[PDB]
Amino acid sequence: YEVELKGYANDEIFEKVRETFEFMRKEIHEDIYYQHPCRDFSKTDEALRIRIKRFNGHNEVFLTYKGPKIDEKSKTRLEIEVEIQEDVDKYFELLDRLGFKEVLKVVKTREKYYVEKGVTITLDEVEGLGKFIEIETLVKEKDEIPEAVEKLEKILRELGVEKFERRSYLELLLEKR
Amino acid sequence: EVELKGYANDEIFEKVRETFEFMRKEIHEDIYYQHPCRDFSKTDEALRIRIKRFNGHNEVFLTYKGPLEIEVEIQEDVDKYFELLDRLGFKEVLKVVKTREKYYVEKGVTITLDEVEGLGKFIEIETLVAVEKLEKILRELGVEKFERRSYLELLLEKRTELN
């Protein structure tokens, strides 16, 4: 599982990260989140998204399904992700035909930083929400999530993060609709 | 995409091989799905993952058929696509296996000789724009019984009557 924690940020936290960790790369993300044709994802805590990632003149697109959060202390959830290598428009059309309707588009910039082996921090500037900081690392077993969460929470708090958020950017933006 | 299908047999298959230019032979396994809440059998829609084998390799496609077709190639992680479909509520209805031989008739016209597991031999013809033209071609090959129902539909009907 990809253990992930998110906190609200600011110029202070952003700068500290830039002066503490190795910069990997900056990406622009344009996500389109969908609603299921038969069930309310907001009630089942699921998500389906198409993400367009832009960096270094490159463009990558991914279709990702996210399962319900399984941890009370983090945003960790099961994920199934495939890369759309071509015909991006066809995937958009396929989802539409199957009844998946766009709920909202989330746009942000993300600066990725190397923390330690398998641990990455991202500085996010989300349109319509502001600055956030995320941290993630992979774990094999579900029972390993608690330890990882503690480790990642410590890293973020040591950077100045005080307010954590388990709600997705999508949920946060929907609240402001 | 104007397409027609007819019941075939060894003779019809043979006539095709002698008359038209062989293009390619492929083996297909089509995994058809039911929509999480729309009954595709009532909305005249379909969604399938096709795994084709030809020229020593496999190619995978995800295709939606409207009541008019969206097809994308799965170059990697087909297992993830199976999982994604399951997670989204799509359920396997039936897996259709067939061997297909494609033949070139003329500019923009192709014929396929299909040996469908559990159903038998069929011949399909397709072109882009026409029906009377393709119809005549098939009739001259000895085709006497056409079929608008898909292999999936036929296999399901066959199962229902058999039980």
Tell me whether A101 touches chain B (CB under 8 Å).
no
**A84-97 core/surface letters (b: 16 or more CB in 10 A; e: else):** beeeeebbbebbeb
Separation in Å, CA of A89 to nearest CA in chain B? 10
Q: What is the CATH number of the domain that holds A171?
A: 2.40.320.10
Tell me whether B47 touches chain A (CB under 8 Å).
yes
What resolution in angstrom units was achieved for this structure?
A: 1.6
Are A65 and B84 an interchain contact pair (Cβ–Cβ within 8 Å)? yes
Q: Which long-range contacts (CB under 8 A, 24 or more apart) does B137-145 make?
A: B137/B105, B137/B109, B137/B111, B138/B4, B138/B6, B141/B12, B141/B15, B141/B16, B141/B19, B142/B11, B142/B12, B142/B15, B143/B6, B143/B7, B143/B8, B143/B12, B144/B6, B144/B7, B145/B6, B145/B7
Report how many domains make up chain A.
Answer: 1
**Contact, A36 vs A100, CB < 8 A?**
yes
Residue A55 pairs in a beta bridge with A58
Q: Which of B27, B69, B25 is closest to B47 using CA atoms?
A: B69
Query: E strands of B35-145, at which residues?
Result: 46-54, 57-65, 69-74, 91-106, 109-116, 120-127
Experimental method: X-ray
**Contact, B33 vs B89, CB < 8 A?**
no
The residue range of the domain holding B75 is 1-163
Are A94 and B37 an interchain contact pair (Cβ–Cβ within 8 Å)? no
- Count of beta carbons in the 10 Å neighbourhood of residue B12: 19
Tell me whether A62 touches chain B (CB under 8 Å).
no
Separation in Å, CA of A67 to nearest CA in chain B? 8
**Chain A interface disruption, residue of B47, B49, B88, most A CBs within 10 A:** B88
Q: Which of A174, A172, A159, A152 is closest to A71 using CA atoms?
A: A152
